[PDB]
Symmetry: D2
Subunit: 311 residues, 4 copies
């Protein structure tokens, strides 16, 4: 008997969604595959609406299948994978997958990527590891996974703590598992939410303008993430505006433009004095995901920093 | 006789039996006696700010200083914080007309901490500035025993002493026992080969940076447009793509004469011309391998020469 | 009250062994530190004798202390760390540490490395993770840890599955733990052994000579590890000699000269037909360590391959 | 008109509506029709062996072939297995006298497998060989959309399609939409700049490779010495250090005229001269950034010109 695997498509086909078993016939060797098109967007236009639709669809469909494969554009797959990692309560494998080359282009990466994603979704050993991304023969956790290169087929890496397992000949040797709390160990429950808190991201650099930061504060954003320089440091005029945000009802999280390493609490900036949160290893777009969800439960920066310290 | 090397300091000491004085750079030199073995060192404290508050006016003061003092010394080392070094290095790479080595240096640990990186990093920067073979390679960054070109160099890790790398095209050479095996030189045009001359400039064109992500707000890109910014750099997703509403604001801006450069939040690889975005229809410029903060430096300088998007693209193709 | 930490020195001082608390006085803030010089060799001369002396000394001294820090030259620290990972039955932190710069050289890395190693040995959270290496603000597992660069202070990486935790301001955020069985979950017991099986390593390349391989076979080695090309492939004349070794009493393990990735069982070479074992992610010098210990229990290649599949 | 490019095949097809013939390289070309868009392609099957059984005689046949046929074509692509490509590429880098592009290519997946890398890799190798800007950069490796110099290129991962990298000095350029932005060229002397001429050679000097590790046996290094090998490369620990008993055998050998090169099992960085080992006392040569298999290629060729350890070191300093 082979596992039942639901492929949820968010966009264009990566090898329509009901044809994938004929476009990649090897799938019939490993699974009984059923396809649903949940939405159809370019990944560069991903949004909160699509996030909620997916977490609700997986949590509702958990009983109907043995595992999920989500097909998704590469540009924001790291964002969607972490949102799902925190909001999904289904304990069955959820595996995200995309393609750095078009399906019609030479040596297209989609077919094998889809095959390997199905392998991962079918593997008993894949349960209880949080939401996964499978790209380039590798199983990565939805928390640390990011894109490292604009075009490379091998772009997706877990740049801080590394991959969970490598896939060879339809087999996974898992050697690691994310200790950070995920899926049904989080208190984030989006079953009844139809919007998320307003969180924007502002960039730091030499002679940075406070205008982006002031635009979000004047819009009344619930949250702002700073893509800091070095260990989450802030250009003076940005630092001034955020200091104002934090004492007037905008949660402020210090992340980093630097691609690897933690932004560490009270090391470069007096977080306690300013009412700021340090993102740790969460890059600015991941720290947005968790800020949004922290803001569904609390606006107390000491409670948001504890959230940033276990999820 | 030993070469004459100037240290130009922009902030704190990265290193440090001697009396501490009021001048940071004078304590620095006493903190690293072995410098006497390789150079006649002279320090000047140009400014004293944290690198997280680096700005246009420090960039103008340094380029002008290096250009003015070129005949006075055999080389320059600049002590600089790590957070924005990659931006200042590229600025100086495009605007220095001196063909003597200009080497930037910093440290990821405090000078007081255990196993402070600053003292050795400074020694290796002076080694580099003293090497006749360092000349005509552009402005350089020397960190963790490695020579990095100012164009491609970036910080990869928030705390690692080894964070500085040329993430696309790799290092120029490695330093062992005070000697450099140079195997590489940047092909993009730099220093006396660029048309950018900052010698009479008081100020630089205004260029802001917007981030793209899921559900991105247009409000940062609108704020820059309403302030009438000369240029905006987009930190795009994947190969420079933009969120729909950010796209919409920047498409309108380009139409009314804002210069728009697509860069990427992705830490390696080119944002390539007309690939994910018809740059020709919109009047956008692709940044190449330049990261958002690096593309800002080139866009500011491009805008001193031209406001035409097609000439700006050819600039982003040559420098 | 502060933890009791035993520093075992194998060689020259990295900041004599009883002075380290005065050379790095910050240690008195985190631990009560006692030093023993177990042996004094250059790490390039490391050997089986020194291995057994250490595992016996730690297993015997486990009751007398809260944790161990071993000071060791960088050239073979990856070898000693895995030997100890497999042979130590003490459940208290054992942390290996060295220095890529001399203690007397400018910006010497030893002091902080020693401090951070003591931090790791003192951390409750460090128990039960196997034998650790702490280099360059990073906690790495003794299985995957290797040197990547001849001179860099940041050389030590876990190149396949990544680090366990990063150390900031005397604090570890552990986010990973090796799933491979270690310490008291292995059957390797060296308490009564005074030598180990004879295992040598032979290199593959274009026009490789069979002479190295034939020298080990004629010496009657218990084991040979091949540093294969690509996915553990063998130059014809090497392949011929090893095929002969395996059917006449020499266990043969296929590793790789390639610095990352597994040598995978029966993918490039018919392991079952030749009586060979595939090393997986174990590089040639690590696969030697585990072959030596597998050979203390069995000479059946199917039993050695199962050993290579869980340790 | 399109450039004329020769494919020289050494084994299996890396790619593959057509009739399959007995000649691998003829099936290869039919398997990648889009080649017609960029080149007039002509294939020759030079040899047919697995790359794990690469040898001196294939290296001699290829260099001689490229050198002989240089006037007949605009460029060369060599199809080669991945396991030893890095060795053949460097051999050809030192012995090709043709200054037209020579591009090596392979594939990490089977041509039959899903998402086979071979077809696109071959297209990108032909693109590279067809680019006038590829010339005078040495023998090249093109894999996963990247141009790598034959000196520094190596395989980093047993299975990854992205395994090939220039791990010390980085890539020469990246390929996007059939176009290469070259930002780098190898400074070490290659091709028509080396003194190695293989045109009359029937065979190469015998050079073996010994591994170092804890408790290393001397028996491999003794076997090579007793066979009277012209040279031995040591895969040292850290910065080329040797286990005591391996040291002992190689010290004795060097004394009786065996050439001894210290390389390292460590996958990046230089093995540096008189640093961890007094090379002057022992008559040893430091390999630099060359890995053991790369140092063997240069040592074999060094030994066609000289057996003096000091001249061999200067060769390891220049090529």
């Amino acid at each position: 008997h082979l596992p039942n695997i639901t492929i949820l498509a968010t966009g264009g086909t990566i090898a329509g969604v009901e044809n994938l078993v004929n476009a990649v016939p090897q799938l019939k060797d490993i699974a009984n595959v059923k396809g649903e098109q949940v939405v159809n967007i370019g990944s560069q236009d991903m949004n909160d609406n699509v996030w909620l639709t997916l977490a609700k669809k997986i949590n509702t469909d958990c009983d109907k299948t043995d595992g999920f494969v989500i097909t998704h554009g590469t540009t924001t797959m790291e964002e969607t994978a972490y949102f799902l990692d925190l909001t999904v309560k289904c304990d069955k494998p959820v595996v995200m997958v995309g393609a750095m080359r078009p399906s019609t282009s030479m040596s297209a990466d989609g077919p094998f990527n889809l095959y390997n994603a199905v392998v991962t979704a079918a593997d008993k050993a894949s349960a209880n590891r949080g939401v996964l991304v499978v790209m380039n023969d590798t199983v990565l956790d939805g928390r640390d996974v990011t894109t490292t290169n604009t075009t490379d087929v091998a772009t997706f890496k877990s740049v801080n703590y590394g991959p969970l397992g490598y896939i060879h000949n339809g087999k996974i040797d898992y050697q690691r598992t994310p200790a950070r709390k995920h899926t049904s160990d989080t208190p984030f429950d989006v079953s009844k939410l139809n919007e998320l808190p307003k969180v924007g991201i502002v960039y730091n650099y030499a002679n940075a303008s406070d205008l982006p930061a002031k635009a979000l504060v004047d819009a009344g954003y619930d949250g702002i993430v700073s893509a800091g320089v070095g260990n989450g440091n802030l250009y003076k005029s940005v630092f001034d505006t955020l200091a104002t945000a934090a004492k007037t009802g905008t949660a402020v999280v210090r992340s980093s433009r630097v691609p690897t390493g933690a932004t560490t609490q009270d090391a470069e900036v007096d977080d306690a004095k300013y009412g700021f949160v340090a993102s740790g290893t969460l890059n600015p777009q991941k720290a947005r995901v968790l800020l949004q969800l922290a803001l569904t439960q609390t606006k107390d920066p000491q409670q948001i920093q504890q959230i940033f310290n276990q999820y």
